[PDB]
Ligand binder design. Structure first.
Ligand SMILES: [Ca+2]
Ligand SMILES: [Ca+2]
Ligand SMILES: [Ca+2]
Lengths: 546, 546, 570
């Protein structure tokens, strides 16, 4: 049957892309990811259509109207592949099957179709470095070492190999080698003991993984974030991170992608400083020949520090300090600082809406492609009772009714109960209560999104941080090269109190600032310091017109 | 016994002020009402201390910490006198007894004491025109017409008397005369049939009422609003409103008050246009010899109209059109437009916090003494299920717990259930959830109140509405006469979008605007139009410094 | 236009039944009301089909499958006529138009059609003693006393007339004469000032009113409870209640109904002791020639007293002192002690031995005036809810269930007229409209609210109060003895237990046995069932066979507040 992967007799058989119906493709656009606003949404958390207490693919399809209305450009889904779920689905049991709980592969095709028909793209995580103990390849590797899958994983008779390579999960794991009961040998894992690393020295492993990519792209997905890529290859006498063999493989994966499925995106999961992470964009001379995107991690904690210090410098510095990137490349940016490795936006700022709105303005005007996390648009919170990764993974708060309008199933059959937090709970903050109030958090972010879309300068423009006498105020221009090109001005007050600013806008003398929210013309720029004034944590967006 | 009024044998006996313990008085201040911010609070709605489902006097005493913290100057209580409650307590059965449900007179003395000790004054409604059918005077009037109380009310053998006088409650009443079953005569009532009018032509009636005033003032109350005063006297061939005999009686009531209890306040309940209502301040030459305060009704609907039109003119006009008032006089102002005769602030503005905050800034900076209605500080709502007067009278929303933290009694024994409205209900909006969030509605109004207190110009300063090129922006200065006197500047944006303003502040050349919320110095004023800039519905408060 | 009533130009003109579609009548059964379980439901409270926030007739139509499933034989609607609603719709402004909020006359016809096709009947209230102040008849009477409607109401030049009549609502009113501002004459009202009394001494008023009956009967309705009937006629030197002329008029109404629309029901509303109410059944020699039905009010207070006292005596005594009734008549029974046209529990100094006792018991005292639903009344005690429901369903008469009692709904205080709780979701599945625009907010009570108690939740689970009520109703239907059987209380050694037999006369006639434990503790009882030697009791709920009856007294055993139902088979 099409659904599932089956082992017989000694070879692991998987369905090809042809076996399923092909969803409608979207017109080829090489640099769509530059202009895209991403929406990361957990399938299990969004909407439950089958009425079993856990959100599913069919449930997501229903809520595409909402997402399109909100105005997001691409949906980003955490892993949904078949798994025993010992590590939240990052322990993949089968690359060729959707977790039965979330639906079938046919349901995924129906998602990719419905979303495409609304002009919304889909990308997912794809764990690269490791699989689950439960994966058939590993079950074959440990049983028949002389079989075709015997060299799929890293095997050793000793534990005294690849020293100096750090142990990632220091709290749980004590070594990167684990003694397998059946095969009676040690195996490699940078993560959990139930997550054995693939042996990327094996050419069959490379191809098998390129085939996994080929599969999902054939179904119609618009790209992947490639997970745990800094740990792909390992060589004796090193720290086993960021190796030349790792980069070379990713370059090859790009070459395949560009050839067979042109116009898709590849993002690199790498929790590291920019300038270290910049390697994953590849060679600058090619215009980028590795991953299209990597994330800018220090941005958000710098924004936070700027607000607490009431000073622009922490923000202006990391931007000035950010390495230049190739043409066919973009920084992924988001209002968080932890990956794997959390809190959520609203509770981090003590529920201060002006401050949230400021952070959101920043997110949507700074260089890069913004990523919103499901429920940030309504100021949802986290839960401590669950701790870190499970605490942010609570069901979407649509209404103040039973189950927050997320499921019709009996409360108790739910995977997690919606938070009844006195401030961030579903009775206090939800979609229904905010859809009609014009100044709600929900309608605010929809407005900015709409405004951002009419101005390419936010997405692909240059960045010029201006200077003011006032250290509390961050002002900058985003400009598209060429005469009569999109030019926007962004003024942000990091102080909790009203502030005056003088800006040197001589560069745009005789231009007229037109405020983007209400199209009100402001005094034209002269040869004189341009004076603006803002309340605590306010911001202005202007188009500079000629 | 001290609690209650008793009839024997043909004379109605009432306890004197001496019979109770005198609460601690507050140092004499003739013009305290000019600087006061009033807080109108329904006893039944605030806090239930006896655990019976209806709020009481003892419950209020507990919440004085909250009120003082919030920073209000005087508590205003709707009628709490003994009553059958056929008309919400405005049908008074006994002037000399607190409604048993709310407590005793001793509990009221303990309130007036505790509040005074916190520097907070107390005022209450005192219904003047009429009493209840249930009142002993009327029961004596209808039984023995030749007795001492026989001429206490207006009696007639016919209904064809005082025509041309309008019937107020057209929906219910059909005539201002009602046929009494016992006495077999008609009696006068401008309000309900169970609310017979006092005969103010009778000198004994006048004195008895001056004695009622003398009673409560002796207990220690800081003043009254005198209810239904436009209807006190009646004369054949008129509309029986606003008669010279009515004004003359009030002048006499003032003379008594000033002599026997100096430093108290008298407010007139009159639902009429300013210039018509201005009569109730008395003769201007005396500096005011009638009521100290009357309300400015058209203000709030003019503020609303200004915001919908996005134009200052509706506001600037009624202020320019407001008649001048005597020295010892003040306009009472509030964010409502109905008395008797409603909605609440937040739901009227579709829960737009910026707009609420704008209206509140206006309230606290415009000429007069502001009056906040209990729960406005947290954006409470109304309930349609109850209709008009009972719909606004819902219990105070302290917490998101059982009964909203208002009562510990079993829900069901409550007088009214707290609203579980999806947006304005106690789970969505409450004191507890807003006390910690710095930018909450609750902490915003506390900040403005605090700021207002340090600036007498808001209370007793002159009013100069400046002019700007921008019609959307209302700017004005409040200035206390005399060199080095308190001078504040208020700039308010009525547009929902960001606006620029040029102000002619030549009158204060070389002055320095210092923003009151954060004490940030702004550019000094020159001989040049002063440019400010504001987001949608923002405002600035400045002190102009020398 | 067909909808409304209009005064053109001096005469109040109204539409006829022929102007609307005729609803299909059921096969004529003159004694259906004896075998019927009634279900009383506020139109406003049941289901909102128009999405306006208020319940409507169209909504009730959608909910008929549920009522049929539950197993009720007749729906009873409180007043739904056009009204200003100054007194719960009992102040009628127009008899010929449905209150716009609930829909039109055309919606009502469709309801009768949809109900009958399921085998369910419809009855409603009809206020007979008074109309609203706002009624066209009163407006014409006050304006032109010389006109046709001038004598439709009772007018006097003095208040000192009919001084022997009491004031029903002593709190709101101080006289039964209100002085009119326009006509300048006192008019008579037995209730509120805005409810002037019709003058039944006027032949035109009578004929006009029986035409109102003709209208709704012609549309398809199966009956009315005729409201405020004890007060129709007034006479100087009398207390103005229960006058022979009042009864005479009602006999004429019954005469017309039987002749023109055979097989309908007329119920007398009268807040009186049984023995006083029995007059409203009419002349027994006829078989009954007035009202078919009247309510037995002291029943449930006596049941309540019996449970608290743990003694059958208060129940035994009222059954024993209940006067026999005409052949074509039935007591209506319900778990309340007064109706909506009065404030206080029906009682009697002379004929009620528990007269002073109800006050001495705290739990009972809190139920003299206040109307509560069944579950709250009994502190949500399932055993007692089931016990009272067994009593209501097995004692003589036709039982009336109040909407929502079957799922154990509660009250509010400001309140039994709250929205029906269908589901635990938005608006309790009552309406699709905004929560703020609903006529009243669905109870969100932690114990009685819609999240904890609703139809959907209970329909599934077999142990639910809903499934109890449905089983009982189903069991009762299989046994005519409950509806029309004789009553025979049994001799027993234990007064903690109330036991009785219901028997249809004749050979092979339906015979059931009911045994009810009033004690909160387990009790043994030996019953004198010699009359049924060799008969076998089969428990009705699970068809379990109990020991054959001998000549020896028969022993049963019950736990606190338990009960059994048996068929005595041969
Ligand atoms: Ca590896
Ligand atoms: Ca008067
Ligand atoms: Ca009558």
């Amino acid at each position: 049957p099409v659904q599932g992967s089956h082992v017989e007799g000694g070879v692991v058989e998987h369905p090809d892309a042809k076996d399923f119906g092909s969803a409608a493709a979207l017109p080829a656009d090489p640099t769509w990811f530059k202009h895209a606003v991403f929406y990361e949404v957990l399938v299990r958390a969004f909407f439950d259509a089958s009425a079993d207490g856990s959100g599913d693919l069919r449930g997501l399809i229903d809520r595409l109207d909402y997402l399109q209305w909100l105005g997001i450009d691409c949906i980003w889904l955490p892993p949904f592949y078949d798994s025993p779920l010992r590590d939240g689905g990052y322990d993949i049991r089968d690359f060729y099957k959707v977790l039965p709980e979330f639906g079938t592969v046919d349901d995924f095709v129906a998602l990719v179709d419905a979303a495409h028909r609304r002009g919304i793209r889909i990308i997912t995580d794809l764990v690269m470095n490791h699989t689950s103990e439960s994966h058939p390849w590993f079950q074959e590797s440990r049983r028949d070492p002389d079989g075709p899958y015997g060299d799929y994983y890293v095997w050793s008779d000793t534990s005294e190999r690849y020293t100096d390579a750090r142990i990632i999960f220091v709290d749980t794991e004590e070594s990167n080698w684990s003694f397998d009961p059946v095969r009676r040998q040690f195996y490699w894992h940078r993560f959990f003991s139930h997550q054995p690393d693939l042996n990327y020295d094996n050419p069959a492993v490379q191809e098998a993984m390129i085939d996994v990519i080929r599969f999902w792209l054939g179904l119609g997905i618009d790209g992947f974030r490639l997970d745990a890529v800094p740990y792909l290859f390992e060589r004796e006498g090193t720290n086993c991170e960021n190796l030349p063999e790792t980069h070379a493989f990713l370059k090859r994966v790009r070459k395949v992608v560009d050839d067979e499925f042109p116009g898709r995106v590849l993002l690199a999961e790498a929790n590291q400083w920019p300038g270290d992470v910049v390697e994953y964009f590849g060679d600058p001379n090619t215009g980028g020949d590795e991953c299209h995107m990597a994330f800018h991690f220090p941005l958000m904690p710098r924004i936070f520090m700027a607000v607490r210090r009431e000073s622009r410098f922490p923000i202006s510095e990391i931007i000035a300090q950010t390495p230049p990137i190739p043409d066919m490349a973009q920084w992924g940016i988001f209002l968080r600082n932890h990956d794997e490795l959390r809190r959520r936006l609203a509770p981090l700022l003590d529920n201060d809406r002006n401050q949230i709105e400021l952070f959101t303005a920043l997110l949507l005007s700074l260089p890069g492609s913004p990523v919103l996390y499901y429920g940030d648009e309504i100021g949802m919170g986290d839960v401590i009772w669950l701790g870190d990764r499970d605490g942010v993974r609570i069901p979407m708060q649509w209404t103040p009714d039973r189950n927050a309008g997320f499921s019709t199933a009996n409360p108790g059959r739910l995977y997690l109960p919606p938070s009844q937090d006195p401030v961030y709970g579903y009775q206090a903050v939800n979609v229904e209560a905010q859809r009609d109030t014009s100044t709600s958090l929900l309608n605010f972010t929809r407005t900015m999104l709409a405004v951002r879309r009419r101005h390419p300068a936010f997405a692909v423009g240059a960045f010029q941080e201006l200077g003011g006498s006032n250290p509390s105020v961050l002002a900058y221009v985003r400009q598209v090269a060429g005469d009569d090109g999109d030019t926007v001005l962004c003024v942000n007050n990091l102080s909790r109190f009203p502030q005056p600013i003088e800006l040197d806008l001589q560069q745009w003398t005789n231009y007229t600032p037109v405020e983007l929210t209400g199209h009100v013309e402001f005094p034209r720029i002269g040869q004189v310091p341009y004076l603006l004034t803002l309340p605590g944590h306010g911001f202005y967006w202007f188009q500079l017109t000629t």
